[PDB]
Design a protein around this ligand. Sequence first.
Ligand code: HEM
Ligand code: HEM
Ligand SMILES: Cc1cc(N)nc(C[C@@H]2CNC[C@@H]2OCCNCC(F)(F)c2cccc(Cl)c2)c1
Ligand SMILES: Cc1cc(N)nc(C[C@@H]2CNC[C@@H]2OCCNCC(F)(F)c2cccc(Cl)c2)c1
Ligand SMILES: C[C@H](O)[C@H](O)[C@H]1CNc2nc(N)[nH]c(=O)c2N1
Ligand SMILES: C[C@H](O)[C@H](O)[C@H]1CNc2nc(N)[nH]c(=O)c2N1
Ligand SMILES: [Zn+2]
Lengths: 410, 412
Amino acid sequence: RFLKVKNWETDVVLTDTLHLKSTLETGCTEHICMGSIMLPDVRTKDQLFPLAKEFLDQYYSSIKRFGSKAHMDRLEEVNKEIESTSTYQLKDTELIYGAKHAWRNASRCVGRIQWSKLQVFDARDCTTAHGMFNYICNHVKYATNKGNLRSAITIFPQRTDGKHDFRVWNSQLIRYAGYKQPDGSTLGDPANVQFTEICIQQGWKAPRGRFDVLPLLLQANGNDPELFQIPPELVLEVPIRHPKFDWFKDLGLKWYGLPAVSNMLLEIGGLEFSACPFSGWYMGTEIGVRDYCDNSRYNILEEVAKKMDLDMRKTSSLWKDQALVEINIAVLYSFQSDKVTIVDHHSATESFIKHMENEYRCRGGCPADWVWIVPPMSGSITPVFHQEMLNYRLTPSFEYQPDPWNTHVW
Amino acid sequence: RFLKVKNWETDVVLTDTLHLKSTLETGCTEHICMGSIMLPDVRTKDQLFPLAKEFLDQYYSSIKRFGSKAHMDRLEEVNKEIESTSTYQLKDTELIYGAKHAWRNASRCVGRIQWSKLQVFDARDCTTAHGMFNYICNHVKYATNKGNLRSAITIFPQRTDGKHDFRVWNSQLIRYAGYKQPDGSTLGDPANVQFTEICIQQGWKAPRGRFDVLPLLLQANGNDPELFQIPPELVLEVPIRHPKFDWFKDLGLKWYGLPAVSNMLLEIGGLEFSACPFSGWYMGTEIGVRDYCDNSRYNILEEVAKKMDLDMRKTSSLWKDQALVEINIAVLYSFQSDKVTIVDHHSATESFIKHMENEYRCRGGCPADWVWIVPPMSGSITPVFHQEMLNYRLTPSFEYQPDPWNTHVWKG
Ligand code: HEM
Ligand code: HEM
Ligand SMILES: Cc1cc(N)nc(C[C@@H]2CNC[C@@H]2OCCNCC(F)(F)c2cccc(Cl)c2)c1
Ligand SMILES: Cc1cc(N)nc(C[C@@H]2CNC[C@@H]2OCCNCC(F)(F)c2cccc(Cl)c2)c1
Ligand SMILES: C[C@H](O)[C@H](O)[C@H]1CNc2nc(N)[nH]c(=O)c2N1
Ligand SMILES: C[C@H](O)[C@H](O)[C@H]1CNc2nc(N)[nH]c(=O)c2N1
Ligand SMILES: [Zn+2]
């Protein structure tokens, strides 16, 4: 019931008490662990008030006013609002606190040392897709900040009866198009082929290139989604070169500087924000290991290894491993030379261990999903590999939601 | 019931039914996942007979004799043995099937494609530490096979009252001593410092070098353990050199060829085999990533990166990653050049995925601990990184057991 986590490199043992406030289900049972599974009608008046109360209690606790008149008055006001309206509205202070805590609670996020420095853009007054587009360009410009990136979230209106959802159809605000070719191969990012098809069939004129920034497909008020191109000048991109290999730049590789997740659902005090795009800055391996080297992505290992003239005849020469490191050296070098914030996996995981220690010391724990927190390369030479982590679900939370094209009816 | 697992690289979806045979608990609940926690007297008659029966039913199904007279007779014979003597003895065939299935069921093992090829040495007639020493020598020689490694396991007598346990005190049959210096540094393997001090206290004469093979410390029949030195001609070692870098040999690195886990408990049909040393062959990353490059182990990253003249002033040059790959190239090269079996992490994971898919078709599942199956370098360029896995506990099994110096009743 009171749980210990041990770091096997340092022998430091921490005691987790925060997990007892967990609520949602993990997917695990006593008989089966689903730790490696990626994915393991709106709230009635009955379900919503426990959720609001739970949230407001933690809020008033945080501002050291638990059980105060102002605490009791707010519970009163919200209770009244729910019974009479079937939902309620967060105060600005509550929305800011809830958004920061959703990030603080994100068990899969290695960058949470930053959780309290988050710029919240309140877009609850938005009513159209054009409005959404404006809010998103401003988010993009603010976060990008000419390369000196700033964490931000933009929060559109909450779910009502669920027939009027706000949704950004894109999985991220900035992503490259994917096209299936007569050749049989794939040009661009293979992960975006389906979305790119939905874009073309809504009218987008695809440049039909390798690195075409996709248009936004925005849905306001449960309406059919609409297409907008982000002003090209707001999308900061980085050409990829290597500090030692001249030929590298000739591969013709670039990536964008702003990672911005746009398909998640923010839950605060039982209220659901179906469109809540947020952004920070990249850890280099995301681009260099996953984006460039996954077999189902840009898949460039073979090409790089060839230009390095490594022995590709046997897996045991570790040619994939050598080329992997070089590609990751190139990503980091290129972002650093163009002064676009990026963090390496050594530095990011070191920060997260320090963050974990703060969260144990100050909050009684830190939910963490080791499968996602340990970087996709050089696992055991980062300190997080040796750190036991307990994974549990706290609210406010970010939750994955299914692609809306499955859900939506035109 | 059915549980689905997806591979996110191939879109292959598999269906697990075998998890319905899982009995033991995981450490996880609906509210907490303990998937990255490393560790998440006798049995009574009434808890033993169900376990025996479950096991014998599985054994007789495997041989296509479920429900036979031979099957029913063995159940009755075991029943009678338990009620009379409070335990029972496995037949040789059952012991062999049991030992192979514990490996098959080992969810943290990437090498399981090989499970049915395992040489079982029945050491249940052993009575003394000297007898244990002889059995272990024969195991080392057989398994080593002059570099052509063969999987093997030696099984000493089972637990009785838990006061007469056979135990191998070494965590592996072959490992290097560690010595803490007064200045706080470590000579040799820092992981083995405490064990090394026990051996010394037991009267081992320590050479005090960087790669001193530890003596065996063997406990028979709950007696105080006894020290034995493995004959050096039985310990195959590989000097580590690099195919391109001629300075690599002068780091003075070597490693032993035979990885042989000696501290685990084997459970078959509710019987507990507290000494059951087993061995296979290394995956290169075990030595090159963990043994050499963990900060709490030989910790050679700095010295290697120094000699490679890497830019070491900022982590973002990825100097550690670069040095790491070259050390692992060296390990695989050296083992291969000396014709000592080893497998790289690409080939091992690819084989494991084929094994896992086969197991799903023929068995209805393959419990797998992703946290351990994914290699400690280059994780996402191996196919296991992208494979969803279900972790659950089947018996027969291997279990961790606490180190014996904590629990042992010294007789003097
Ligand atoms: C400041 C820089 C940040 C860094 C370096 C960072 C790092 C990361 C990384 C490496 C992942 C794994 C994602 C993947 O492999 O696809 C991740 C996941 C995640 N992070 Fe962060 N993060 C940052 C900012 C943020 C912010 C600002 C938020 C929320 C406001 C956030 C919330 C999340 C969530 C919800 C996930 C899981 C995403 C999913 O399930 O797809 N992070 N983080
Ligand atoms: C034949 C070649 C084999 C290879 C390449 C191999 C590979 C591995 C590796 C890399 C691990 C993780 C070990 C670690 O990180 O410390 C492991 C774990 C394990 N394997 Fe194997 N294995 C092999 C044979 C065997 C055999 C013969 C058995 C038993 C009969 C076995 C049973 C186990 C068990 C019980 C674990 C978990 C160990 C623990 O909890 O400390 N494996 N295997
Ligand atoms: C099935 C599925 C479930 C979940 N929960 N997430 C995904 C998304 C999958 C999981 N890894 C790849 C893909 O992520 C794309 C977004 N990556 C993070 C980032 F690049 F956007 C990023 C990076 C740093 C900081 C921030 Cl704010 C954002 C898929
Ligand atoms: C706390 C704790 C719990 C558990 N279950 N295991 C350990 C042992 C921990 C787990 N990783 C480090 C240490 O293993 C050292 C032995 N490595 C395996 C091998 F080298 F012996 C090996 C390799 C390949 C094949 C075989 Cl048969 C054997 C520690
Ligand atoms: C099946 C497995 O859970 C899946 O491949 C995970 C593993 N760890 C990950 N870790 C991160 N950060 N991002 C991912 O997309 C994944 N994918
Ligand atoms: C805390 C964490 O569970 C621990 O460091 C694990 C991670 N994965 C591992 N995987 C293997 N193969 N061997 C290990 O020792 C570990 N250690
Ligand atoms: Zn679990």
